[PDB]
Amino acid sequence: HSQGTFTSDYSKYLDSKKAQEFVQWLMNT
Amino acid sequence: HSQGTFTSDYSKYLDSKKAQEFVQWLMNT
Amino acid sequence: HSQGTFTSDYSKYLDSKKAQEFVQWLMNT
Protein backbone atom coordinates (compact mmCIF):
# COMPACT_ATOMS: atom_id res chain seq x y z
CA HIS A 1 0.00 0.00 0.00
CA SER A 2 1.11 3.46 1.23
CA GLN A 3 4.82 2.56 0.95
CA GLY A 4 3.70 -0.56 -0.98
CA THR A 5 6.77 -0.64 -3.32
CA PHE A 6 9.76 1.14 -4.93
CA THR A 7 12.88 -0.51 -3.40
CA SER A 8 11.26 -3.87 -3.86
CA ASP A 9 11.92 -2.45 -7.35
CA TYR A 10 14.56 0.03 -8.52
CA SER A 11 17.55 -1.75 -6.95
CA LYS A 12 18.66 -3.77 -9.94
CA TYR A 13 19.48 -0.82 -12.29
CA LEU A 14 22.07 -0.50 -9.52
CA ASP A 15 23.05 -4.10 -10.29
CA SER A 16 22.75 -3.13 -13.96
CA LYS A 17 25.47 -0.53 -13.43
CA LYS A 18 27.32 -3.11 -11.25
CA ALA A 19 27.25 -5.26 -14.37
CA GLN A 20 28.85 -2.62 -16.62
CA GLU A 21 31.61 -2.60 -13.98
CA PHE A 22 32.32 -6.37 -14.38
CA VAL A 23 33.24 -5.51 -18.03
CA GLN A 24 34.40 -1.98 -17.05
CA TRP A 25 36.59 -4.48 -15.42
CA LEU A 26 36.52 -7.49 -17.88
CA MET A 27 37.98 -5.03 -20.37
CA ASN A 28 38.52 -1.28 -19.77
CA THR A 29 40.11 -0.09 -22.97
CA HIS B 1 39.90 1.85 22.36
CA SER B 2 42.93 1.50 20.04
CA GLN B 3 40.73 0.78 17.00
CA GLY B 4 37.75 1.89 19.14
CA THR B 5 35.78 3.47 16.22
CA PHE B 6 35.72 4.92 12.66
CA THR B 7 33.70 2.40 10.57
CA SER B 8 31.19 2.17 13.37
CA ASP B 9 30.99 5.72 11.98
CA TYR B 10 31.81 7.03 8.50
CA SER B 11 29.74 4.46 6.57
CA LYS B 12 26.55 6.46 6.18
CA TYR B 13 28.02 9.37 4.10
CA LEU B 14 28.33 6.36 1.78
CA ASP B 15 24.59 5.84 2.27
CA SER B 16 24.27 9.62 1.92
CA LYS B 17 25.74 9.35 -1.57
CA LYS B 18 23.60 6.21 -2.09
CA ALA B 19 20.68 8.51 -1.37
CA GLN B 20 21.63 11.08 -4.03
CA GLU B 21 21.57 8.08 -6.39
CA PHE B 22 17.90 7.22 -5.56
CA VAL B 23 17.07 10.71 -6.98
CA GLN B 24 20.05 10.60 -9.39
CA TRP B 25 17.67 7.92 -10.29
CA LEU B 26 14.23 9.36 -9.17
CA MET B 27 14.99 12.13 -11.65
CA ASN B 28 18.26 12.56 -13.61
CA THR B 29 17.63 15.59 -15.74
CA HIS C 1 35.01 -26.26 -13.43
CA SER C 2 32.82 -24.77 -16.21
CA GLN C 3 31.93 -21.70 -14.11
CA GLY C 4 34.69 -22.82 -11.69
CA THR C 5 35.76 -19.24 -10.71
CA PHE C 6 35.81 -15.47 -11.45
CA THR C 7 33.63 -13.86 -8.73
CA SER C 8 35.28 -16.06 -6.17
CA ASP C 9 37.96 -13.68 -7.50
CA TYR C 10 37.61 -10.19 -8.99
CA SER C 11 35.45 -8.74 -6.19
CA LYS C 12 38.19 -7.17 -4.10
CA TYR C 13 39.47 -4.66 -6.74
CA LEU C 14 35.95 -3.42 -5.96
CA ASP C 15 37.00 -3.31 -2.31
CA SER C 16 40.28 -1.82 -3.55
CA LYS C 17 38.32 1.08 -5.02
CA LYS C 18 36.17 1.07 -1.83
CA ALA C 19 39.46 1.63 -0.03
CA GLN C 20 40.44 4.69 -2.10
CA GLU C 21 37.04 6.03 -1.00
CA PHE C 22 37.88 5.72 2.75
CA VAL C 23 40.72 8.22 2.03
CA GLN C 24 38.73 9.87 -0.81
CA TRP C 25 36.95 10.39 2.38
CA LEU C 26 39.81 10.43 5.02
CA MET C 27 41.08 13.41 3.06
CA ASN C 28 39.62 14.74 -0.23
CA THR C 29 41.74 17.75 -1.00
Side-chain angles (χ1 to χ4, degrees), chain B residues 5-24:
Chain B
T5 58
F6 231 40
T7 0
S8 294
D9 181 20
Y10 139 68
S11 300
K12 271 86 48 196
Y13 152 119
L14 195 279
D15 308 326
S16 286
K17 262 156 33 99
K18 252 258 80 287
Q20 250 53 334
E21 262 193 45
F22 192 44
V23 266
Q24 168 273 124

PDB file of all heavy atoms in Angstrom, chain B residues 5-24:
ATOM      1  N   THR B   5      36.578   2.757  17.274  1.00  0.00           N
ATOM      2  CA  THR B   5      35.784   3.474  16.220  1.00  0.00           C
ATOM      3  C   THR B   5      36.128   4.497  15.113  1.00  0.00           C
ATOM      4  O   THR B   5      36.703   5.556  15.327  1.00  0.00           O
ATOM      5  CB  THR B   5      34.338   3.769  16.699  1.00  0.00           C
ATOM      6  OG1 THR B   5      34.357   4.543  17.901  1.00  0.00           O
ATOM      7  CG2 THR B   5      33.623   2.483  16.959  1.00  0.00           C
ATOM      8  N   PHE B   6      35.668   4.129  13.914  1.00  0.00           N
ATOM      9  CA  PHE B   6      35.718   4.917  12.662  1.00  0.00           C
ATOM     10  C   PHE B   6      34.843   4.395  11.469  1.00  0.00           C
ATOM     11  O   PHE B   6      34.435   5.168  10.557  1.00  0.00           O
ATOM     12  CB  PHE B   6      37.152   5.247  12.224  1.00  0.00           C
ATOM     13  CG  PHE B   6      37.320   6.707  11.946  1.00  0.00           C
ATOM     14  CD1 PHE B   6      36.702   7.627  12.797  1.00  0.00           C
ATOM     15  CD2 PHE B   6      37.947   7.158  10.783  1.00  0.00           C
ATOM     16  CE1 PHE B   6      36.690   8.976  12.484  1.00  0.00           C
ATOM     17  CE2 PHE B   6      37.947   8.517  10.458  1.00  0.00           C
ATOM     18  CZ  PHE B   6      37.313   9.434  11.305  1.00  0.00           C
ATOM     19  N   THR B   7      34.535   3.094  11.540  1.00  0.00           N
ATOM     20  CA  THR B   7      33.700   2.401  10.572  1.00  0.00           C
ATOM     21  C   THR B   7      32.360   2.237  11.265  1.00  0.00           C
ATOM     22  O   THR B   7      31.297   2.210  10.634  1.00  0.00           O
ATOM     23  CB  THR B   7      34.335   1.063  10.059  1.00  0.00           C
ATOM     24  OG1 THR B   7      35.625   0.831  10.683  1.00  0.00           O
ATOM     25  CG2 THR B   7      34.536   1.192   8.515  1.00  0.00           C
ATOM     26  N   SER B   8      32.414   2.176  12.588  1.00  0.00           N
ATOM     27  CA  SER B   8      31.189   2.167  13.367  1.00  0.00           C
ATOM     28  C   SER B   8      30.994   3.701  13.390  1.00  0.00           C
ATOM     29  O   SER B   8      30.872   4.317  14.467  1.00  0.00           O
ATOM     30  CB  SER B   8      31.404   1.662  14.817  1.00  0.00           C
ATOM     31  OG  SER B   8      31.784   0.301  14.929  1.00  0.00           O
ATOM     32  N   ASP B   9      31.127   4.299  12.202  1.00  0.00           N
ATOM     33  CA  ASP B   9      30.991   5.725  11.980  1.00  0.00           C
ATOM     34  C   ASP B   9      30.766   6.003  10.516  1.00  0.00           C
ATOM     35  O   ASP B   9      29.710   5.684   9.951  1.00  0.00           O
ATOM     36  CB  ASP B   9      32.225   6.541  12.466  1.00  0.00           C
ATOM     37  CG  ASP B   9      32.062   8.098  12.252  1.00  0.00           C
ATOM     38  OD1 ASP B   9      30.929   8.623  12.104  1.00  0.00           O
ATOM     39  OD2 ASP B   9      33.079   8.830  12.227  1.00  0.00           O
ATOM     40  N   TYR B  10      31.808   6.566   9.908  1.00  0.00           N
ATOM     41  CA  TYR B  10      31.809   7.029   8.496  1.00  0.00           C
ATOM     42  C   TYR B  10      30.805   6.442   7.464  1.00  0.00           C
ATOM     43  O   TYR B  10      30.280   7.170   6.643  1.00  0.00           O
ATOM     44  CB  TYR B  10      33.277   7.017   7.917  1.00  0.00           C
ATOM     45  CG  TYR B  10      33.369   6.502   6.481  1.00  0.00           C
ATOM     46  CD1 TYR B  10      32.818   7.246   5.423  1.00  0.00           C
ATOM     47  CD2 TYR B  10      33.877   5.216   6.189  1.00  0.00           C
ATOM     48  CE1 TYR B  10      32.750   6.725   4.136  1.00  0.00           C
ATOM     49  CE2 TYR B  10      33.821   4.690   4.885  1.00  0.00           C
ATOM     50  CZ  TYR B  10      33.246   5.448   3.855  1.00  0.00           C
ATOM     51  OH  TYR B  10      33.110   4.983   2.547  1.00  0.00           O
ATOM     52  N   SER B  11      30.530   5.152   7.555  1.00  0.00           N
ATOM     53  CA  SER B  11      29.741   4.460   6.574  1.00  0.00           C
ATOM     54  C   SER B  11      28.350   4.889   6.104  1.00  0.00           C
ATOM     55  O   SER B  11      27.765   4.253   5.224  1.00  0.00           O
ATOM     56  CB  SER B  11      29.863   2.961   6.834  1.00  0.00           C
ATOM     57  OG  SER B  11      31.234   2.543   6.725  1.00  0.00           O
ATOM     58  N   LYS B  12      27.843   5.992   6.630  1.00  0.00           N
ATOM     59  CA  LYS B  12      26.551   6.463   6.178  1.00  0.00           C
ATOM     60  C   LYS B  12      26.656   7.547   5.100  1.00  0.00           C
ATOM     61  O   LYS B  12      25.678   7.729   4.341  1.00  0.00           O
ATOM     62  CB  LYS B  12      25.649   6.921   7.320  1.00  0.00           C
ATOM     63  CG  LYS B  12      24.798   5.806   7.889  1.00  0.00           C
ATOM     64  CD  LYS B  12      25.605   5.084   8.956  1.00  0.00           C
ATOM     65  CE  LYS B  12      26.271   6.092   9.928  1.00  0.00           C
ATOM     66  NZ  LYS B  12      27.373   5.536  10.776  1.00  0.00           N
ATOM     67  N   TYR B  13      27.751   8.332   5.112  1.00  0.00           N
ATOM     68  CA  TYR B  13      28.020   9.368   4.097  1.00  0.00           C
ATOM     69  C   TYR B  13      27.996   8.582   2.743  1.00  0.00           C
ATOM     70  O   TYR B  13      27.620   9.104   1.661  1.00  0.00           O
ATOM     71  CB  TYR B  13      29.379  10.030   4.421  1.00  0.00           C
ATOM     72  CG  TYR B  13      30.209  10.636   3.279  1.00  0.00           C
ATOM     73  CD1 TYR B  13      30.529  12.004   3.280  1.00  0.00           C
ATOM     74  CD2 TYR B  13      30.777   9.836   2.267  1.00  0.00           C
ATOM     75  CE1 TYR B  13      31.405  12.572   2.313  1.00  0.00           C
ATOM     76  CE2 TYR B  13      31.649  10.398   1.277  1.00  0.00           C
ATOM     77  CZ  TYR B  13      31.966  11.784   1.314  1.00  0.00           C
ATOM     78  OH  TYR B  13      32.839  12.379   0.385  1.00  0.00           O
ATOM     79  N   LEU B  14      28.348   7.298   2.870  1.00  0.00           N
ATOM     80  CA  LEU B  14      28.325   6.358   1.776  1.00  0.00           C
ATOM     81  C   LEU B  14      26.831   6.165   1.399  1.00  0.00           C
ATOM     82  O   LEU B  14      26.442   6.191   0.214  1.00  0.00           O
ATOM     83  CB  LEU B  14      28.956   5.049   2.230  1.00  0.00           C
ATOM     84  CG  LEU B  14      29.356   4.023   1.144  1.00  0.00           C
ATOM     85  CD1 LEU B  14      28.183   3.171   0.625  1.00  0.00           C
ATOM     86  CD2 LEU B  14      30.101   4.699   0.007  1.00  0.00           C
ATOM     87  N   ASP B  15      26.016   5.989   2.424  1.00  0.00           N
ATOM     88  CA  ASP B  15      24.587   5.843   2.266  1.00  0.00           C
ATOM     89  C   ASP B  15      23.980   7.228   1.925  1.00  0.00           C
ATOM     90  O   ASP B  15      22.904   7.344   1.306  1.00  0.00           O
ATOM     91  CB  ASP B  15      24.001   5.243   3.542  1.00  0.00           C
ATOM     92  CG  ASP B  15      24.734   3.936   3.973  1.00  0.00           C
ATOM     93  OD1 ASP B  15      25.172   3.174   3.049  1.00  0.00           O
ATOM     94  OD2 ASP B  15      24.868   3.688   5.225  1.00  0.00           O
ATOM     95  N   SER B  16      24.725   8.278   2.229  1.00  0.00           N
ATOM     96  CA  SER B  16      24.269   9.623   1.921  1.00  0.00           C
ATOM     97  C   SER B  16      24.486   9.858   0.399  1.00  0.00           C
ATOM     98  O   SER B  16      23.754  10.642  -0.278  1.00  0.00           O
ATOM     99  CB  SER B  16      25.011  10.650   2.793  1.00  0.00           C
ATOM    100  OG  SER B  16      24.553  10.634   4.128  1.00  0.00           O
ATOM    101  N   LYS B  17      25.525   9.224  -0.139  1.00  0.00           N
ATOM    102  CA  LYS B  17      25.745   9.354  -1.565  1.00  0.00           C
ATOM    103  C   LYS B  17      24.841   8.288  -2.159  1.00  0.00           C
ATOM    104  O   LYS B  17      24.467   8.436  -3.284  1.00  0.00           O
ATOM    105  CB  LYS B  17      27.204   9.072  -1.971  1.00  0.00           C
ATOM    106  CG  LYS B  17      28.182  10.260  -2.179  1.00  0.00           C
ATOM    107  CD  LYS B  17      29.648   9.801  -1.973  1.00  0.00           C
ATOM    108  CE  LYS B  17      29.924   8.311  -2.426  1.00  0.00           C
ATOM    109  NZ  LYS B  17      30.549   8.037  -3.788  1.00  0.00           N
ATOM    110  N   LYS B  18      24.501   7.202  -1.463  1.00  0.00           N
ATOM    111  CA  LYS B  18      23.596   6.208  -2.091  1.00  0.00           C
ATOM    112  C   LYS B  18      22.176   6.712  -2.120  1.00  0.00           C
ATOM    113  O   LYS B  18      21.301   6.104  -2.731  1.00  0.00           O
ATOM    114  CB  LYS B  18      23.640   4.816  -1.426  1.00  0.00           C
ATOM    115  CG  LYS B  18      24.340   3.709  -2.257  1.00  0.00           C
ATOM    116  CD  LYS B  18      23.390   2.701  -2.998  1.00  0.00           C
ATOM    117  CE  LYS B  18      22.781   3.202  -4.344  1.00  0.00           C
ATOM    118  NZ  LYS B  18      21.689   4.256  -4.350  1.00  0.00           N
ATOM    119  N   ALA B  19      21.966   7.821  -1.416  1.00  0.00           N
ATOM    120  CA  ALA B  19      20.677   8.512  -1.370  1.00  0.00           C
ATOM    121  C   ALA B  19      20.519   9.430  -2.583  1.00  0.00           C
ATOM    122  O   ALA B  19      19.434   9.507  -3.181  1.00  0.00           O
ATOM    123  CB  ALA B  19      20.585   9.327  -0.117  1.00  0.00           C
ATOM    124  N   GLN B  20      21.585  10.183  -2.879  1.00  0.00           N
ATOM    125  CA  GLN B  20      21.625  11.085  -4.032  1.00  0.00           C
ATOM    126  C   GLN B  20      21.393  10.306  -5.321  1.00  0.00           C
ATOM    127  O   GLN B  20      20.892  10.871  -6.313  1.00  0.00           O
ATOM    128  CB  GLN B  20      22.943  11.847  -4.082  1.00  0.00           C
ATOM    129  CG  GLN B  20      22.822  13.329  -3.762  1.00  0.00           C
ATOM    130  CD  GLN B  20      22.108  13.637  -2.444  1.00  0.00           C
ATOM    131  OE1 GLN B  20      21.282  12.861  -1.953  1.00  0.00           O
ATOM    132  NE2 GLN B  20      22.414  14.803  -1.876  1.00  0.00           N
ATOM    133  N   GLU B  21      21.759   9.019  -5.292  1.00  0.00           N
ATOM    134  CA  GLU B  21      21.569   8.080  -6.390  1.00  0.00           C
ATOM    135  C   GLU B  21      20.102   7.761  -6.514  1.00  0.00           C
ATOM    136  O   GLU B  21      19.622   7.760  -7.612  1.00  0.00           O
ATOM    137  CB  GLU B  21      22.315   6.768  -6.159  1.00  0.00           C
ATOM    138  CG  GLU B  21      23.708   6.551  -6.823  1.00  0.00           C
ATOM    139  CD  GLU B  21      24.133   5.053  -6.737  1.00  0.00           C
ATOM    140  OE1 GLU B  21      23.285   4.168  -7.017  1.00  0.00           O
ATOM    141  OE2 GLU B  21      25.289   4.744  -6.332  1.00  0.00           O
ATOM    142  N   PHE B  22      19.362   7.517  -5.422  1.00  0.00           N
ATOM    143  CA  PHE B  22      17.903   7.223  -5.562  1.00  0.00           C
ATOM    144  C   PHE B  22      17.070   8.313  -6.261  1.00  0.00           C
ATOM    145  O   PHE B  22      15.955   8.068  -6.700  1.00  0.00           O
ATOM    146  CB  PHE B  22      17.202   6.820  -4.257  1.00  0.00           C
ATOM    147  CG  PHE B  22      15.806   6.262  -4.479  1.00  0.00           C
ATOM    148  CD1 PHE B  22      15.560   5.345  -5.518  1.00  0.00           C
ATOM    149  CD2 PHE B  22      14.698   6.741  -3.755  1.00  0.00           C
ATOM    150  CE1 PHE B  22      14.234   4.921  -5.849  1.00  0.00           C
ATOM    151  CE2 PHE B  22      13.345   6.312  -4.080  1.00  0.00           C
ATOM    152  CZ  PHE B  22      13.132   5.407  -5.133  1.00  0.00           C
ATOM    153  N   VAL B  23      17.634   9.517  -6.324  1.00  0.00           N
ATOM    154  CA  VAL B  23      17.071  10.710  -6.976  1.00  0.00           C
ATOM    155  C   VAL B  23      17.918  10.929  -8.242  1.00  0.00           C
ATOM    156  O   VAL B  23      17.436  11.483  -9.237  1.00  0.00           O
ATOM    157  CB  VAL B  23      17.064  12.008  -6.010  1.00  0.00           C
ATOM    158  CG1 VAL B  23      15.731  12.134  -5.297  1.00  0.00           C
ATOM    159  CG2 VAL B  23      18.164  11.915  -4.949  1.00  0.00           C
ATOM    160  N   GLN B  24      19.196  10.541  -8.184  1.00  0.00           N
ATOM    161  CA  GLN B  24      20.054  10.601  -9.386  1.00  0.00           C
ATOM    162  C   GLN B  24      19.160   9.732 -10.271  1.00  0.00           C
ATOM    163  O   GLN B  24      18.977   9.956 -11.476  1.00  0.00           O
ATOM    164  CB  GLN B  24      21.444   9.900  -9.170  1.00  0.00           C
ATOM    165  CG  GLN B  24      22.365   9.624 -10.434  1.00  0.00           C
ATOM    166  CD  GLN B  24      22.106   8.271 -11.200  1.00  0.00           C
ATOM    167  OE1 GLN B  24      21.842   8.258 -12.413  1.00  0.00           O
ATOM    168  NE2 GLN B  24      22.238   7.141 -10.497  1.00  0.00           N
TER     169      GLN B  24
END
